[PDB]
Structure formats: structure tokens, C-alpha cells
C-alpha atoms as a printed R data frame, in Angstrom:
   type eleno elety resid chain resno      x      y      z
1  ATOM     1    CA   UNK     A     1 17.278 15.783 -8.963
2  ATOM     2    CA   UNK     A     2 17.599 14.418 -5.477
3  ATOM     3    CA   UNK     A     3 15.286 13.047 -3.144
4  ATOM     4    CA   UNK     A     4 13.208 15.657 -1.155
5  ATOM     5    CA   UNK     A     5 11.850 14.915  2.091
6  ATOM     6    CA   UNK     A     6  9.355 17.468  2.067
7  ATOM     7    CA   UNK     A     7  8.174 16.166 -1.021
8  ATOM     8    CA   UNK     A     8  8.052 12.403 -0.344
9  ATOM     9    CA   UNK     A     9  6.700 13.584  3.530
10 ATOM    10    CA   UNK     A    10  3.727 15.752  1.635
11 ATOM    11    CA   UNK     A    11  3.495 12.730 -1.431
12 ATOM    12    CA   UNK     A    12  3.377 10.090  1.563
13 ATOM    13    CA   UNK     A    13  1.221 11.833  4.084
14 ATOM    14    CA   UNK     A    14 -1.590 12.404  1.414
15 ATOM    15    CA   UNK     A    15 -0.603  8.497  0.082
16 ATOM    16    CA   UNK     A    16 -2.992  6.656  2.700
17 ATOM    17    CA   UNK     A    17  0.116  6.547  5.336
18 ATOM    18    CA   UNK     A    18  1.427  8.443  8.179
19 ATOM    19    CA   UNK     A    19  4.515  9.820  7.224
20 ATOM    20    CA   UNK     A    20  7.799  8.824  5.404
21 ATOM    21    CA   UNK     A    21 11.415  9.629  5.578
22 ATOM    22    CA   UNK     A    22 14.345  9.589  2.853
23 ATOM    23    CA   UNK     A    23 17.415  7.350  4.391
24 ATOM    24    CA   UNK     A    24 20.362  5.582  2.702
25 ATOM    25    CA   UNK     A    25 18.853  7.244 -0.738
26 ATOM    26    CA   UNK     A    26 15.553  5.718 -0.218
27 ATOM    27    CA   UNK     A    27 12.398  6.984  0.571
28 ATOM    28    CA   UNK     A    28 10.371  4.647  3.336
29 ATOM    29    CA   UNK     A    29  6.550  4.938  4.000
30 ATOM    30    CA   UNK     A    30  5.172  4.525  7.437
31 ATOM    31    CA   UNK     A    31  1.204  4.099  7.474
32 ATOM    32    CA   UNK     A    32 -0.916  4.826 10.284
């Protein structure tokens, strides 16, 4: 599988945090 941005955006929106965003092959968080 690869990494999904909708996925990881849903996952890290409902995670305590803002938003994140899937660059260079890894996922970042960004909190309020």
C-alpha cells in the first residue's frame, strides 16, 4: 500500500491536530 492523504488528513484531523500532509514519503501532523 501507499500512503493516502485522505487517509492520514481524516486519521490526523480526528488525532487532536489540524491537519497533515504526506511529503517525501512521510506523513507530517500539523496541530492547531
Amino acid at each position: 500500500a501507499v500512503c493516502v492523504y485522505r487517509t492520514c488528513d481524516k486519521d490526523c484531523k480526528r488525532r487532536g491536530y489540524r491537519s497533515g500532509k504526506c511529503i517525501n514519503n512521510a506523513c507530517k501532523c500539523y496541530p492547531y
